[PDB]
With several copies, the nearest count.
Chain A
Amino acid sequence: RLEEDSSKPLIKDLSSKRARGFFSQDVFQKI
């Protein structure tokens, strides 16, 4: 139990991103 009381992205990777970084792999480019 999480007992609680009663009272700009930080990871800025410089340059969806996940989809375009995954579906752009070697096998997908090769087919």
Chain B
Amino acid sequence: EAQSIGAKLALVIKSGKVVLGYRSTLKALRSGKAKLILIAANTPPLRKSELEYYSMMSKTPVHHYSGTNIELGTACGKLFRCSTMAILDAGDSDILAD
């Protein structure tokens, strides 16, 4: 269902508010307004664990993307690597309904 994952990621970035990169994701979690977190597979384990701890404190849901950072960036539509990404606004996507 990774095809659907990519389709709804493209739709949610086209509709709502999206921030990319570790520093932006961490700032969003600290602000406590982020509604979804995605962590890539090849993300360093300490970085992953810190992000999961932040998300658990902020009660912001987090999902582990199957592919690596380059694949996550390609699916999100930009031409660079993205280890972690945060969705602030869903726009008109059903990504948060589940």
Give A residues with C-beta under 8 Å from B: 8-15
Contacts and interface: CB of A to CB of B under 8 A. Distances in A.
B interface majority secondary structure? mixed
Contacts of B59: 10
Interface in B73-98: 95-96, 98
Interface in B36-52: 36
A interface majority secondary structure? loop
A8 B4 contact: no
Contacts, number: 27
Interface residues of B, number: 15
Nearest to B63: A12
B25 interface: no
Interface of B: 1, 4-5, 8, 36, 55-56, 59, 61-64, 95-96, 98
B61 A14 contact: no
Contacts of B4: 14-15
A10 B62 contact: yes
Contact of B56 (A9, A10, A12, A13): A10
Given A8-B61, A10-B61, A10-B62, A15 B1 contact: yes
